[PDB]
């Protein structure tokens, strides 16, 4: 009944983009957005690994963005954003300095029942448009209201303009744009007064029109000027031509118009489909046969427009200008094709960003060729797990032999991402699994270091409780017994000084210098007590004893030699831990490398000193609490502190600290605060986690540089994680849960081992390990993107032979039309003009992908008929009397022929087996091959397929059959009559759960003694189901349903309840609203959680979520927290988390919402609060923070799969 939603992978895929002064008026910024998440970019020119987009800020929302614009307000130092959320919500946000968050300036709530005009089912999205001059801003609420925001507080009170109360009775708004010049804000509006449909054009030829309303901000009056009424019927978006020419260009599907107030209407036709469907005067464009129906465009300078068509093809329109700035003709050219975009923005002049949902959103660069013709090259691309259609769970092929006897199953997910030309597969895999190439058994030793001796690592320095081991590395690693190092006792640190020219180890008595094996000299160090840890800079070595005494050593070139320099440090309290840091891309400017020291004291004060001197530069007075933003001012116990620079050329520093079995890490951002002379111009911002530290010093925070190119920090402990920042600048935390807890870590570059690492097992085992090279660790999950260049529909892992069967599709031009004369089919060849685009016919094929190398297996491809479309593919466990069990595990495909609505659609069931045969010499992958057993036409379209105890269950038409696989044929056993179109089925233990497109789910049941199939229960309410799952509890079995209104809901079959009939009605017991559509569903058991399963799913906007079932008592301790987190915390864009996660029925029926799912991304903000603020929310709901953290962190431990 009770559950918790949790988000595993963020949504990838962009819908919105712009180019605005987000941080400051000095530079512009690419601010892109998508499904409920906002990304802000910079553009690096001198990037190591050529231009590259660098992430500057990432922002998450409790609501899906429906439009986005920007305007620079009067007296503002930045460029505010105008976000727009579903059913008439506006929010004006700026970037906030000081902190590093967003700041809401204005909130606008325009959803009242008198504005909906009686229409409950809203279709029209709110559309924010702003002025080119910044005078006002307009939102199209509900398609019949214009909200006008006046500009100069920075805002004037808004006023709603009724669209249908104007002249010309607008009533169906297509697109609306503000125009240039025209002294007052002028708003052009495309509309249709008498709407028609393409398909009914013989009685309504061309009905589109234009109103250029002129807004008076003060007087609140607005007259209609410059109306046209004879535009073609299929007019999509309009675009405002800039100021030196002025006017508007209007995209239609088959034509392109330039319209201006004084100029006569000019427009050309793009293909010969405006012959009998358009009476507007259109000329014929020369050498151009395309269409503009779903096309994005932007203006480069003035008179040049770049258009991204469907198919991804890029054209550049040139407005041929006369002497009086009047557009005379058009000019097209076919430039290089690109991704199927959803957005289009010019950056710095010479660049185009191309946002896309389906495909990798990439940045371009245009130069002129030597009229002007441009050439486009690709600079950077952003990785995109696309519109996840179907997704199968499988086992990877390269698990190392040391990790084979692990108790938990080792598995990954393969996702059908993208569409069309950008169709692909995505091999997602959450945790990092190393390749142990050489293991050891070295007990007793706990710490470890690798130094560079004459960039390969030369030595391996192992510290024991009484001695110290040395390993000479090279062609074959071998333990060293000669002089040099101190092996009579332990070592607390061992690293390089200078620039990889020396080796410095620290004993608890002193410090030795080393040119490799040869010891240079030795400096004993009493320093009160024995040395507990040391940190290293390039000339600096800073020592800390057990009683807080700090000394510093410095290289002086004499030949080099460490020199004692005692620091002047006013010890009002004892120093607990230390850290050193150098600048290589300096934001530590404090009003060429620069060295810095970090020093945590026992009173809770954190101090940064500029390291050549010892002056105090930065001071946080209450540090171990875990505040969100660290601000200078000049307990839980702080264990370990590490400052590290990560990214392109060591750009951005991070602060990683350890406070009472809790990891809390910080970013760093510049901040010019005029409140002193000698202070750092930086502040630190806490960033969220999924990592807990819940089970003479061992460092957990161990910085690595260049392990497989990637640089970052490995965080040791009971739950080891990889911290990674590449040149993207995006923070990446990847777990490593195999091989248990990890005690120590070191990078290790050798000959027999490539760029790689080296770590201790908890059982005392040294492991030479290399990261596996087929994944990309720059994405939020480690993923390999597999380009298919065709739309992947279904994927199914076949357990025998260990392969994937992928259903693909490519677009071919259609050439025939099926007819029906009563007895047989007749085909009419489409014979048209030469200036004619063809409709796209889809031809399907079934691939066979191998997990070893992810290429397709050659000569293994089932190709279907001409008009035949796979509607489902699942791995089907049919029964057989051959193996030791009953079940076999074939692959069945349900497919049928789409030939229009006047031809009877029939289907075919395609049952396939993958059998290992002998491979052809020269190709190792050709050992696998399909064997089609069953291929027979059915009596109607095959729309869903499943298995019940070895019986193939199929949905042909308005019936659901249940077949039995014989030696060669299927025999029918049972059937029922069902709903309109069963497009999904699932099954558990002779209980079928079907799903209709329009009506609802309907569970079935099959007795095996009597060959009968029976409807047990169903839902009578109408519901547009996408796909179905089973919520599995200890003894409860829920029926998880995803919907068209982005809703998750859980039905149960409860005959004891009175609000149903007697076993004849399904009763929903949980309601929830994910922000995206869901087609895929997975189950796996978790890592009190004795017999439950986790219903994983992948959203259709590119994310992955969870639903973890819980007890009733654990639900209600956290529901008291969720209501406290909703009200008592500020949210981005003023959005309400309760209002976003409630059910979104766009009707009214008798079904009051049963909310039994927690918001685990709202509950994830309780982990983000400081421990002073963490206890205030516990005292107000009558609990302690130890009880809540034993509930929020246990939902992260059992949900650490993949």
């Amino acid at each position: 009944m009770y559950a918790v939603y949790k988000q595993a992978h963020p949504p990838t895929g962009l819908e919105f983009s712009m180019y605005c002064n987000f941080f400051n008026n000095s530079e512009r910024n690419l601010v892109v957005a998508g499904t409920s998440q906002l990304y802000v970019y910079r553009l690096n020119r001198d990037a190591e690994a050529r231009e590259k987009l660098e992430l500057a800020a990432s922002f998450s929302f409790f609501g899906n963005v429906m439009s986005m614009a920007s305007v620079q307000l009067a007296g503002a130092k930045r460029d505010a954003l105008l976000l727009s959320f579903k059913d008439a919500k506006l929010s004006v946000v700026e970037y906030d300095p000081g902190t590093h968050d967003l700041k809401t300036l204005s909130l606008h709530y325009f959803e009242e029942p008198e504005l909906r005009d009686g229409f409950v089912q809203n279709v029209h999205t709110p559309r924010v448009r702003v002025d080119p001059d910044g005078r006002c801003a307009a939102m199209l609420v509900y398609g019949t209201r214009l909200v006008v925001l006046p500009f100069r507080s920075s805002f004037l009170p808004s006023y709603i303009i009724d669209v249908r109360a104007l002249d010309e009775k607008l009533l169906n708004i297509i697109d609306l744009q503000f125009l240039h010049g025209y002294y007052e804000p002028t708003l052009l509006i495309l509309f249709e007064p008498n709407q028609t449909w393409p398909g009914r054009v013989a009685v309504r030829q061309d009905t589109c029109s234009i109103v250029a309303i002129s807004l008076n901000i003060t007087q609140k009056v607005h007259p209609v000027i410059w109306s046209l009424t004879s535009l073609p019927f299929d007019c999509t978006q309009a675009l405002a031509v800039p100021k030196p020419i002025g006017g508007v260009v209007v995209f239609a599907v088959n034509s392109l118009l330039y319209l201006n107030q004084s100029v006569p209407p000019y427009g050309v036709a793009l293909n010969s489909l405006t012959t009998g469907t358009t009476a507007f005067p259109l000329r014929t464009q020369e050498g151009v046969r395309i269409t503009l129906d779903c096309a994005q465009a932007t203006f480069i300078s003035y008179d040049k427009m770049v258009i991204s068509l469907k198919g991804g093809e890029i054209y550049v329109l040139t407005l041929i200008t006369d002497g009086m700035r009047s557009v005379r003709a058009f000019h097209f050219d076919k430039a290089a094709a690109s991704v199927l975009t959803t957005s289009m923005v010019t950056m710095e002049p010479g660049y185009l960003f191309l946002g896309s949902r389906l495909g990798n959103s990439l940045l371009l660069k245009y130069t002129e060729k030597l009229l002007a013709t441009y050439s486009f090259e690709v600079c950077d691309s952003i990785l995109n797990i696309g519109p996840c259609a179907n997704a199968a769970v499988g086992e990877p092929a390269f698990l190392s032999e040391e990790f084979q006897n692990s108790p938990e199953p080792d598995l990954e997910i393969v996702v059908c991402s993208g569409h069309g030309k950008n169709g692909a597969l995505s091999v997602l895999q959450k945790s990092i699994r190393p390749q142990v190439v050489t293991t050891f058994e070295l007990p007793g030793c706990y710490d470890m270091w690798t130094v560079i001796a004459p960039r390969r690592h030369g030595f391996l320095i192992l510290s024991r409780e009484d001695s110290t081991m040395i390993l000479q590395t090279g062609q074959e690693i071998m333990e060293l017994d000669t002089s040099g190092f101190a092996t009579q006792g332990p070592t607390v640190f061992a690293g390089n000084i200078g620039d990889n020219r020396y080796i410095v180890q620290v004993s608890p008595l002193g410090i030795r210098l080393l040119e490799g094996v040869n010891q240079l000299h030795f400096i004993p160090v009493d320093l009160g007590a024995p040395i507990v840890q040391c940190a290293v800079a390039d000339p600096y070595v800073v020592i800390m004893s057990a009683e807080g005494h700090v000394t510093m050593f410095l290289l002086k070139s004499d030949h080099h030699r460490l020199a004692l320099h005692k620091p002047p440090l006013h010890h009002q309290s004892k120093v607990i831990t230390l850290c050193l840091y150098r600048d290589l891309s300096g934001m530590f400017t404090t009003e060429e490398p620069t060295h810095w020291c970090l020093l945590v004291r026992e009173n809770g004060t954190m101090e940064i000193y500029q390291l050549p001197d010892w002056r105090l530069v930065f001071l946080v007075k209450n540090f171990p609490v875990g505040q969100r933003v660290l601000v200078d001012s000049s307990l839980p116990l702080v264990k370990e502190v590490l400052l590290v620079a990560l990214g392109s050329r060591q750009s951005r520093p991070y602060l990683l600290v350890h406070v009472d079995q809790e990891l809390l890490i910080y970013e760093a951002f510049p901040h010019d605060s005029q409140l002193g002379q000698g202070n750092l111009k930086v502040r630190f911002k806490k960033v969220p986690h999924n990592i807990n530290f819940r089970e003479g010093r061992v460092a957990r925070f161990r910085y690595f540089e260049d392990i497989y190119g990637y640089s970052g920090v490995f965080i040791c402990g009971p739950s080891p994680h990889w911290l990674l920042v590449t040149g993207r600048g995006a923070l990446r935390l990847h777990p490593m849960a195999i091989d248990g807890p990890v005690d120590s870590f070191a990078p290790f570059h050798n000959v027999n081992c490539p760029r790689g690492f080296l770590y201790f097992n908890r059982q005392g085992e040294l492991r030479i390990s290399v990261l596996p090279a087929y994944l990309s660790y720059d994405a939020p999950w480690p993923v390999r993107k597999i380009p298919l260049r065709c739309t992947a529909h279904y994927v199914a892992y076949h357990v025998e032979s260990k392969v994937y069967a992928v259903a693909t599709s490519t677009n071919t031009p259609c050439a025939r039309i099926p007819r029906m004369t009563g007895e047989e089919k007749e085909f009419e060849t489409i014979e048209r003009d030469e200036r004619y685009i063809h409709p796209q016919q889809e031809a399907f094929s079934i691939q066979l992908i191998s997990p070893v190398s992810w290429e397709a297996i050659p000569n293994a491809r089932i190709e279907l008929q001409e008009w035949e479309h796979v509607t489902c593919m699942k791995t089907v466990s049919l029964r057989s009397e051959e193996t030791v069990s009953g079940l076999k595990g074939y692959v069945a495909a349900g497919t049928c022929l789409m030939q229009g609505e006047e031809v009877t659609c029939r289907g075919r069931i395609l049952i396939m087996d993958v059998i290992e045969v002998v491979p052809e010499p020269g190709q190792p992958l050709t050992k696998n091959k399909f064997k089609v057993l069953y291929e027979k036409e059915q009596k109607g379209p095959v729309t869903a397929l499943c298995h019940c105890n070895g019986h193939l269950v199929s949905a042909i038409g308005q019936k659901i059959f249940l077949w039995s696989l014989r030696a060669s044929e299927l025999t029918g056993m049972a059937f029922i009559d069902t709903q309109l179109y069963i497009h999904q089925m699932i099954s558990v233990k002779n209980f079928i759960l079907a799903a209709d497109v329009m009506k609802s789910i309907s569970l079935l049941r099959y007795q095996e003694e009597s060959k009968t199939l029976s409807l047990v229960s169903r839902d009578a309410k109408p519901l547009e189901v996408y796909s179905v799952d089973f919520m599995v509890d200890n003894a409860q079995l829920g029926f998880l349903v995803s919907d068209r209104d982005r809703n998750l809901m859980v039905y149960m079959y409860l005959p004891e309840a009175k609000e149903s009939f007697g076993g004849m009605r399904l009763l929903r017991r949980a309601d929830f609203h994910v922000g995206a559509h869901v087609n895929t569903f997975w189950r796996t058991p978790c890592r009190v959680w004795e017999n439950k399963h986790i219903t994983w799913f992948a959203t259709l906007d590119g994310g992955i979520g969870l639903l973890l079932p819980m007890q009733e008592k654990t639900y209600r301790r956290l529901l008291m927290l969720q209501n406290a987190l909703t009200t008592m915390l500020p949210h981005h864009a003023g959005l309400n988390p309760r209002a976003f996660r409630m059910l979104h029925v766009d009707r009214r029926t008798l079904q009051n919402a049963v909310r039994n799912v927690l918001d685990g991304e709202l509950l994830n903000r309780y982990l983000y609060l400081s421990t002073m603020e963490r206890s205030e929310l516990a005292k107000k709901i009558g609990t302690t923070p130890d009880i809540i953290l034993d509930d929020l962190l246990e939902t992260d431990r059992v949900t650490a799969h993949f």
Binding site: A392, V393, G394, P409, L411, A796, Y797, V799, T875, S877, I976, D977, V988, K989, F991, R1005, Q1007, S1010, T1012, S1014, L1015, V1016, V1032, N1034, A1035, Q1036, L1037, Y1053, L1054, P1055, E1056, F1061, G1062, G1063, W1082, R1083, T1084, P1085, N1091, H1093
Partner: protein
């Protein structure tokens, strides 16, 4: 795939318990009904079926 990992053969669900002893199946009104397409009841073959003739399930 979904049964090697998430095996549910060792779980006795309340769905499976509520369909064996029928757990509160109401008697069907209007006794001239057909119910051709419903479940077959195991109570008629083994034990006293009870509401014979006015049972929602068929009788073999």
């Amino acid at each position: 795939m979904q049964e090697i990992i998430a095996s549910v053969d060792h779980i006795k669900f309340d769905l499976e318990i509520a369909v064996e002893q029928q757990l509160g199946a109401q008697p069907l009104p209007f006794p001239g009904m057909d119910k051709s397409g419903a479940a077959v009841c195991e109570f008629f073959l083994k034990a006293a079926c009870g509401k014979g003739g006015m049972c929602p399930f068929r009788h073999i």
